């Protein structure tokens, strides 16, 4: 998955 | 600080939920003061304007409604007249008057003073030559009974033929009578509305500029015909309003002629103030749309708009999105827009987009993804992320910190591997700057620390894992067991202060979803920045759990405050955490100096 913090 | 249920509740109380709502329609542009005043100046000045704002605002609907209420002097008759057998000009006479000039001419300066050249070239040499001369009658394009409302021409498909008109060819030959008008011709005396995106997509911007700057309006011709009609320029009598998103204009704004031609920016806000007056306006607007609306239905929709904005004090201004949700709710309510139908329509939207989360929770439940939501562990924390696919579900991301004796290095493994973005990298560097500058007794830090997310992501971006990372690091240095029942979200600066993060609601709700799926223990919760208090518009289920004492939210201002909650002790009052961290650093220093 591509993720954003 | 703990946030009570009372501090977290943000929703509007509902009284007499099923009572039918009865409210007048608000004026166009309600709560969009800036954009209305800009449009008013453009109307008063005769200036060209552009309407800018995000998609689904109802920009077009607000515009047409507003223009419908204007009053201009009646549009002149507009026509093509031949100045020759291969030349034509665009002409205006006063309203009604072209029909007389057509009857007169059908009689194979009489009283049409302004139509001089067309008669003055209509002469005589059929007799002098016997030359057979039937392409000399005027071509009326438009005519109208009043200038209330003014002409209003919205052409969403801005091809050259739709803007400028067409030449039909009868068998070749053509003549004045075969020229069809375009949107430009129909808008004379009034308003032409185009979409910025269409002008770019159709490649018609340069020709449009030529029409406005030079009066060149060229009916579209075909590649086949042996010849064509010359068309004289003409004085353009219209106001143009472009509509589009901020990004749609940027293509156009790099051209200086755009700024020159379109002076008035009419910008829509993406949110309005959340007030009794805008809730009431929303009500009236929905009723004018045809909805059967109860009070509780209105209230729920108003609160959903606040939540869409992720601001307690603001509401999403996108009326088209509110309408679309209301249409779904109406179906679920059998035609009636109620509190229940709104909540259920929101819940069906989440259900329709839930497959990915169902897959995730199942993997966690099976232990294919390894998460802990109870107990304690050294150097480990649940940070929170959102997956970068709509609808942007929140999830916990397990993160570890390991410390070894070494020469002052803070490593992000994910960043070194090339998985982290620039801001993510900045967050790590910032933590490094905080630790070096905070713990100076031994000179440079006697530790190497490596951070890793436990799952592997194609990429991580953003700064909001900084707090989780810093607490993990301090824990590893001090050997401090941290609670795993509390997830952590926050950006940190070099001074250890905690800064606001994005997608706070999703993040919180995603940890709760994970806790619920594994069985709520009663002690779980989230630590988050105090700076995000104004963004918290949590869903019912989380609010109910917090009211029940089954879930807990903590707001902090500093990284140490977070660490205190996690390690279950204060920094000072020593035996505090600060002396254990110092004790760790001294141990590491001794190992490092053999």
From TrEMBL, chain B:
It is an enzyme of class 3 (hydrolase). GO terms for molecular function: ATP binding; ATP-dependent peptidase activity; serine-type endopeptidase activity. The keyword Magnesium does not apply. One of its GO terms (biological process) is proteolysis. Its EC number is 3.4.21.53. The keyword Protease applies. It holds the Pfam family LonB_AAA-LID. Gene3D superfamilies: 1.10.8.60, 3.30.230.10, P-loop containing nucleotide triphosphate hydrolases. It catalyses: Hydrolysis of proteins in presence of ATP. Keywords: Hydrolase, Protease, Serine protease. Residues 449-569 form the Lon proteolytic domain. InterPro entries: AAA_32 (IPR041699), Lon_proteolytic (IPR008269), Lon_Prtase (IPR027065), LonB_AAA-LID (IPR046843), P-loop_NTPase (IPR027417), Ribosomal_Su5_D2-typ_SF (IPR020568), Ribsml_uS5_D2-typ_fold_subgr (IPR014721). The active site is at 464, 507. Belongs to the peptidase S16 family. This is endopeptidase La. It comes from Meiothermus taiwanensis.
């Amino acid at each position: 998955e591509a993720v954003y913090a | 600080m703990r946030l009570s249920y009372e501090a977290l509740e943000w929703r509007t109380p509902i009284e007499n939920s099923t009572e039918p709502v009865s409210l007048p329609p608000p004026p166009p542009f309600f709560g969009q003061e800036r954009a209305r005043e800009a449009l008013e100046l453009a109307i008063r000045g005769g200036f060209h304007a552009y309407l800018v704002g995000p998609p689904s605002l109802g920009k077009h609907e607000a515009l047409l409604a507003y223009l419908s209420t204007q009053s201009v002097e009646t549009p002149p008759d507009l026509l093509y007249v031949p100045l020759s057998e291969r030349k034509v000009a665009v002409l205006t006479l006063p309203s009604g008057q072209e029909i007389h000039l057509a009857e007169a001419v059908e009689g194979l300066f009489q009283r049409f003073p302004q139509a001089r050249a067309y008669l003055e070239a209509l002469r005589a040499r059929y007799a002098e030559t016997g030359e057979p001369l039937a392409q000399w009658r005027p071509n009326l394009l438009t005519s109208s009974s009043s200038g209330t409302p003014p002409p209003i021409v919205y052409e969403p498909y801005a091809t050259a033929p739709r803007l400028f008109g067409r030449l039909d060819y009868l068998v070749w030959s053509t003549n004045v009578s075969l020229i069809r008008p375009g949107a430009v011709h129909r808008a004379q005396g009034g308003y032409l509305i185009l979409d910025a995106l269409s002008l770019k997509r159709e490649g018609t911007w340069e020709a449009f500029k030529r029409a406005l700057r030079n009066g060149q309006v060229e009916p579209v011709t075909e590649p086949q015909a042996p010849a064509g009609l010359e068309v004289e320029p003409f004085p353009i009598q219209m106001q143009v309003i472009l509509v589009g998103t901020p990004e749609a204009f940027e293509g156009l704004e790099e051209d200086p002629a755009f700024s020159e031609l379109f002076r008035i920016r009419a910008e829509f806000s993406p949110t309005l103030p959340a007030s009794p007056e805008n809730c009431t306006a929303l009500g009236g607007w929905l009723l004018a749309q045809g909805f059967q609306l109860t009070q509780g239905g209105l209230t729920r929709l108003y609160d959903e708009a606040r939540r869409m904005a992720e601001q307690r004090d603001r509401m999403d201004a996108r009326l088209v999105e509110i309408r679309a949700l209301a249409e779904e709710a109406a179906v679920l309510g059998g035609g009636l827009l109620t509190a229940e139908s709104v909540e259920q329509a929101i819940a069906a939207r989440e259900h329709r987009s839930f497959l990915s989360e169902e897959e995730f929770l199942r993997a966690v439940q099976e232990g294919v993804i390894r998460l802990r939501t109870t107990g304690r562990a050294v150097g480990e924390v649940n940070s929170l992320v959102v997956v970068e696919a709509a609808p942007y579900w929140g999830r916990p991301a397990r993160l570890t910190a390991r410390a070894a004796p070494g020469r002052d290095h803070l490593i992000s493994i994910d960043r070194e591997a090339g998985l982290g973005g620039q801001i993510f990298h900045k967050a790590v560097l910032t933590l490094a700057g905080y630790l070096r500058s905070r713990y100076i007794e031994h000179g440079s830090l006697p530790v190497t620390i490596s951070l890793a997310f436990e799952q592997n992501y194609v990429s991580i971006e953003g700064a909001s894992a900084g707090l989780a990372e810093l607490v993990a690091a301090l824990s590893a240095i001090g050997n401090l067991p941290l609670r795993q029942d509390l997830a952590v979200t926050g950006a940190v600066d070099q001074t250890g202060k905690v800064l606001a993060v994005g997608a706070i609601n999703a993040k919180v709700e995603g940890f709760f979803r994970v806790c619920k799926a594994l069985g709520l223990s009663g002690t779980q919760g989230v630590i988050l920045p105090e700076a995000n208090l104004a963004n918290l518009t949590l869903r019912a289920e989380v609010l109910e759990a917090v009211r029940a004492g089954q879930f807990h939210i903590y707001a902090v201002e500093t990284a140490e405050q977070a660490l205190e909650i996690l390690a279950g002790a204060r920094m000072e009052g020593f035996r505090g955490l600060q002396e254990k961290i110092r004790a760790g650093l001294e141990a590491f220093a001794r190992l490092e100096e053999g």
